[PDB]
Amino acid sequence: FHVNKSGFPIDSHTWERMWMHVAKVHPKGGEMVGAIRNAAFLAKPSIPQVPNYRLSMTIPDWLQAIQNYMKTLQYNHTGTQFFEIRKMRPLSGLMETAKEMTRESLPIKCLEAVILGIYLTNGQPSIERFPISFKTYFSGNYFHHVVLGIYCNGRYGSLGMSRRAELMDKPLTFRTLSDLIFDFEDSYKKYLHTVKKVKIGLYVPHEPHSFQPIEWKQLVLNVSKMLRADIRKELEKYARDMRMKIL
Amino acid sequence: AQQELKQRQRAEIYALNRVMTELEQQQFDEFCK
Numbered sequence: 001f002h003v004n005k006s007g008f009p010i011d012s013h014t015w016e017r018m019w020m021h022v023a024k025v026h027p028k029g030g031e032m033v034g035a036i037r038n039a040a041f042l043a044k045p046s047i048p049q050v051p052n053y054r055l056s057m058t059i060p061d062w063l064q065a066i067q068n069y070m071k072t073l074q075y076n077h078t079g080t081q082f083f084e085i086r087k088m089r090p091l092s093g094l095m096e097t098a099k100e101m102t103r104e105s106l107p108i109k110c111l112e113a114v115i116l117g118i119y120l121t122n123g124q125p126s127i128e129r130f131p132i133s134f135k136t137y138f139s140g141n142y143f144h145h146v147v148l149g150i151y152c153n154g155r156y157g158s159l160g161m162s163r164r165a166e167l168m169d170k171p172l173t174f175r176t177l178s179d180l181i182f183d184f185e186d187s188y189k190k191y192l193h194t195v196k197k198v199k200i201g202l203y204v205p206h207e208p209h210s211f212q213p214i215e216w217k218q219l220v221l222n223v224s225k226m227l228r229a230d231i232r233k234e235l236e237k238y239a240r241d242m243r244m245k246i247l
Numbered sequence: 248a249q250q251e252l253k254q255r256q257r258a259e260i261y262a263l264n265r266v267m268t269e270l271e272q273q274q275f276d277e278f279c280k
């Protein structure tokens with residue numbers, strides 16, 4: 001996994017190293033790398049319009065519009081992440097990078113989806129936004145995933161980008177934080193991942209000029225050795241703390 | 248003439264992304280099978 005620190009347009013070292021990785025993993029790479037690289041003309045892909053909240057939308061409607069915008073950007077399968085996200089950057093500068101995303105319109109992976117999730121949900125203060133991170137185990141490997149948890153009018157949900165349809169957006173229909181988290185765990189069971197750790201962040205402030213970093217891990221719990229009855233408790237205490245604006 | 252580089256690279260990136268998506272489904276399908 002390579003990340004582009006060159007900005008736009010992309011400089012030659014990082015560009016070539018993308019086609020590098022693309023020609024190795026593809027069983028018929030190189031044959032097809034040339035066909036894109038060397039082609040006098042390519043179709044100019046459609047630029048999706050960035051959604052704006054209109055008074056005829058419910059919150060679920062706006063949330064689906066944000067998620068549909070991200071799906072149109074597409075998940076990044078190229079191997080080269082195009083927008084660098086430094087997790088502990090001030091919120092202010094991550095928002096600058098989200099602006100980059102909407103204005104450059106390129107594929108994105110899960111972390112960048114979360115930043116853009118935040119950027120598109122600033123401006124609706126009925127929605128609270130907080131990152132959910134998962135460490136999971138499959139076949140002798142550990143993997144890391146992240147989504148945007150969502151809380152609004154007593155219901156929980158998520159926005160996200162994933163290669164798997166069941167590990168991104170979740171409608172605003174879960175009555176506890178635990179029901180949300182437990183849906184992800186069951187979704188991971190479909191792909192034979194065991195959830196080892198779950199990290200819940202803090203509400204992301206709606207000040208887009210905040211220079212504080214996002215809090216990614218106020219709660220960390222080792223769901224592997226824990227029973228569901230006790231995962232629920234630990235998660236339910238923490239969600240309620242979030243709502244009572246203690247944490 | 249710097250924008251033109253973006254627009255072309257965008258067009259190549261989406262072109263390439265189509266292929267890796269279609270690849271990843273055949274890989275995942277033949278996995279299952």
Ligand SMILES: *CC(=O)[C@H](Cc1ccccc1)NS(=O)(=O)c1ccc(C)cc1
Pocket residue numbers: 109110111143144145146161162163164167191193
């Ligand atoms: C957040 C991210 O980059 C992941 C990468 C990943 C995570 C878990 C397992 C493999 C790869 N996003 S993801 O590629 O969409 C993804 C893929 C597969 C699963 C089972 C979950 C997430």
Ligand SMILES: *CC(=O)[C@H](Cc1ccccc1)NS(=O)(=O)c1ccc(C)cc1
Pocket residue numbers: 190191276278279280
């Ligand atoms: C083969 C496989 O792991 C999938 C997993 C899955 C994921 C989400 C929801 C249901 C199932 N099983 S499958 O999709 O039913 C499937 C796909 C392709 C083949 C050849 C067999 C089974």
